[model samples]
Target chain A: HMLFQNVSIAGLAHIDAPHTLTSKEINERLQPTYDRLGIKTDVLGDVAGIHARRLWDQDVQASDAATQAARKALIDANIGIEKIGLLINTSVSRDYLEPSTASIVSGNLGVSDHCMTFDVANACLAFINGMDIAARMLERGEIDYALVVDGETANLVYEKTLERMTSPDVTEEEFRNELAALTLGCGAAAMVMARSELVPDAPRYKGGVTRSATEWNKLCRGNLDRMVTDTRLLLIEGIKLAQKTFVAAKQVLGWAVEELDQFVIAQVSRPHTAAFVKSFGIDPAKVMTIFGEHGNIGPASVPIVLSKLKELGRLKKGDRIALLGIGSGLNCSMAEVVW
Target chain B: VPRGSHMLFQNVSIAGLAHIDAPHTLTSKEINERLQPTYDRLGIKTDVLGDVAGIHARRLWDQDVQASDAATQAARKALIDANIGIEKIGLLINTSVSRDYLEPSTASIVSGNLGVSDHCMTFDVANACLAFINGMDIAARMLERGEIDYALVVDGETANLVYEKTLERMTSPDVTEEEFRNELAALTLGCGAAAMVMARSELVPDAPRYKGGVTRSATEWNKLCRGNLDRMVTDTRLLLIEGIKLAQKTFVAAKQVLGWAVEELDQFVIAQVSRPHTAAFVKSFGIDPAKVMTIFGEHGNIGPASVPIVLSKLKELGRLKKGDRIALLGIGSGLNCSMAEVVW
Candidate 1:
């Protein structure tokens, strides 16, 4: 079966962005447009279930944010920057189209020339892809250590969408399409992975399974400034894709709804989370939710949730963890970790 | 135990190849016709693109062609060349510098167009021009490990917007000489697409074997070139010098790992940004100029797809022969250099 035998998470960390943009403040700004459209509904809090989401202070690039998390991860691993032989940035937010943000982060961390740097983009599932890519090198003993870093900045999208939604000419359809933007938060997460022999006490990463329904690739499209989503269709098709992925997971990962101790999932909204949990028959208490506080951080969301769980002393040694997410590509990945 | 070099790839063979030439060709002479007035106003008298860079023309796709569409076209051709259906493919990795969106990967859009099976995992790899090589190596590792039977590595470059905007700025009366000089590289970029089907060597006895190679990076030079959809700012002087320097180090690792020698290689498929850079690399390595096939003069630089496109053209032209060893090389915008080998 598709599994990684020699890869382990050496260190993991997450950074909470400095500023909090509350849903209350968002609705207040939208109220004028709401009145104009003759509509009254607190969609952010009541419907989306997002109370507040974090944002970095303005002028923070994706590389700088990812660098911060990389430093923290390095410290947690008790290794210096020189030990990192590969660095992959897997964030939806990027600084430039060329000269990858991975290179900038590597430069910031003062990595050696021997370190290979690249960026992987697959919407929210990129971190898992990055992890699996590094695992192959680790399994082959090509590099003893690798860094997978992700940092998402939603300040611009949030700022722009708010302005667009507040315009007098804004239509209800347009406002509803842009509502998902407000639910996106900003955060950074990083992990240092090494060969299992080196991190004997660390959590082992058994590479997972991925199933794609690229027919729905266009359901959720977003850039830095704006995001337009078919939330209605995404919910239905995304869960449908995840259901297929979980079936493959049962074969590859021997996955069972009852055995997994913690389910770290990437959630877009309250309803999306409920549907996913119900579709898979997962225990409600086993899953964690940062969407209410931090919202969706894109690719950083999955690792950030797992880092938060570790901080809270929730994960125990030998506890089986199922890392799950349905990215915008209609790509669903289900990986496992044994702490 | 050695890092990077000891990671010798095994059992990966290139089963199919295809390159799509964009329908429209934009020539430097025609481009200069538009810029002559601006050149006179700035008191500049050099035909840098034609005389200095040796680029006569480059291809451009129509306005409506996205990266995924072009890559899908190439992928379809490559699949046919491989004599396999889409269901047999297990992975799809896109290495295009031009992307359709930031959320769902360009790879997914191509997969949708190709209608790949549910288990065909896909993603986009962005490392500037060297990403295509990185994508092939990534697929190689999975194939070597027997996790996947066959994988597709595709790249589609869209420099239409860059050309459109860069030309507009360079022709503007407000454009300065420094700005004009810095933006010339964008003009050399061509629109094209390429795709390769790689499989485990044992599965394809007649296919070319892809023995993965080495990579070296100079992150300090990463700022030397940066671009987006509209504008590209480059330090051409620094890029040529620094790029050659990085490629030199990568060649050193290649000799140690690949046991590479100039005479032993049958062909050199190098990604071209400028005429001077390729000459410098050949001179530094003592490589035979005849051994390398260059499309930059006619097609210009097609970003990450340049390597595969040239390789594809070589196959189309019957330049590749069985037992011939070819070297794939490039210095990408990330200030990254990679050298991999393919044995036909």
Candidate 2:
């Protein structure tokens, strides 16, 4: 039931920012916020493994970043813009209260009138769900090709949270807790998909599996004006959910720990990834790291890394890749692709 | 492909349900009286609600209660009705158009308010009017597939703010009649909440089982009915025709899959929008008009809660009974139609 018929990864695109601010640079600005919050330890970077990440130019929206990535993806696929049947924007950021981010992306991408668009937001697992949905529709012959796009921006949040928590009247506890902002970065990703028959030479999407641990749902969440998340709890529950998900994956996929070609898991932190791989007896050498540079792209982490791998020429026609994700819903979905 | 994937879950049943409605019912006469001064001020006269939208009256909440508040109320009632504690619930999905905030996910706030256990999963499904039904189907699949034993599907809508804003604009002498007429249906919206608890059939036998339905999307007309927090702009003309078109396609699919015989179905509980639209559906389907009941004239369009609230009222009135086959239908802002079979 989970198999996709001839659904192939036609192309992928991603943007990487190199002007990164190290953990020390981040802590310097956050020092006041930390002092106000009463957090004294050098735990923010050590905790999330997000020492530094990139930021977009001022006021770039989720749809804006996604459009950039989508253009690149279409270019890579060498397909006309009109061929896209579905344009799913699975981003953690949204444009407005009414029209979805996907609609805006579709409008920007100039997708055809026959194209269907919608936003699939399940915290960080949105792109995983998007890939799965597109695969199903692609297999059902609903359309020839589909595109999954994601854009995440944590800069505005970091600035706002830092400003608010750094006020003169701010509490020590509130100031110390502001380090969560330092762990966040901004980026976007896009992937083009086709019916395996349409792009038979492309990498095949074998689909994947998912397990949700909603009980840990409170680990990460935010308000419109200010995000209030329990970073510690998020990391803990994230690893916990990934462990359970890996157990199920091993049972179903019988994923060989050492024989795997590459691991494209959600970019949470350095230690979080270590904790996840350690549980399944997976070799760290096979796992790819991106959170240190890209930070956590939220739901876009897995696909963004896959696109990165494609750009770096690290993938082959028969390479086996795994996409592991852990999101705020405490949901985990792991899938192996026959590239 | 093994003749379509045969998954598990032979039985999926409704374990609990509840709705919270605004107590005050603002009648059509009250609305007309308010419009009288504007009609004279504008030097024009026409019964917009009566003639244009065919809407009589609608209800509104007195205060600005957040969407999450109403959904949490219904969730509590559903939990109680199911004879289960919040701790036992595994998933909570918010299928509401009205939101407390955009980020934290209204579902998370509801989970927090309900004190759902740490193991529970929660998220929001924003598909306009079809969201609750989608949530029901999603939970049913999960429950049936042994993914989870119990899940809560909840929705809450606040149409009062839209009414207040629309009425304020309509009364302005500068406002055009065409624009005013287009905004009348927004006033027809009411405030309410509805919730249903879905569980494995093995958990509760004899409970109403929700058979999956059919869907057809006309997303090209997605902008036909545009909405913001305070007001919703709509293409009333397109909404009616496209709604029926989707309904026709949905019913055809329903007939093929559910063996839906128009006359055999016991009742039709649909989204509460307007009298004319409801009547139009009956006329088109050749359905027994008597089986089609509506609270729209009074409660108006309560977003996704309209369907479940009406069903709950029917149950309370003793109008529904065991083995009764019912249909729950809706056409929302997304121009999406969802029709499902419910057994009481």
Q: Best-fitting candidate, measured by TM-score?
A: 1
Query: Which lDDT tens digits does candidate 1 get at residues B193-221?
Result: 99999999899998999998898888977
Query: Which DockQ values do the candidates obtain, in the order shown?
Result: 0.85, 0.22
Instruction: Give the 10-residue window scoring lowest on summed lDDT in candidate 1 chain A.
Output: A34-43
> lDDT (CA) for every model shown?
0.92, 0.76
Model 1 spans with C-alpha error above 4 angstroms: B1-5
Instruction: Score candidate 2 by TM-score against the native.
Output: 0.77
Give lDDT tens digits, candidate 2, residues B214-269.
66556656677767777777787788998898788878867876778898999999
lDDT of 1 at A237: 91
TM value for model 1 = 0.98
**iRMS for model 2?**
4.4
Per-residue C-alpha lDDT of model 2 across residues A65-113, encoded as one tens digit per residue = 9989899999999998889987888776775544556667776777764
Model 2 chain B — which ten-residue stretch has the worst lDDT? B1-10
Error of 1 at B167 (Å): 1.0
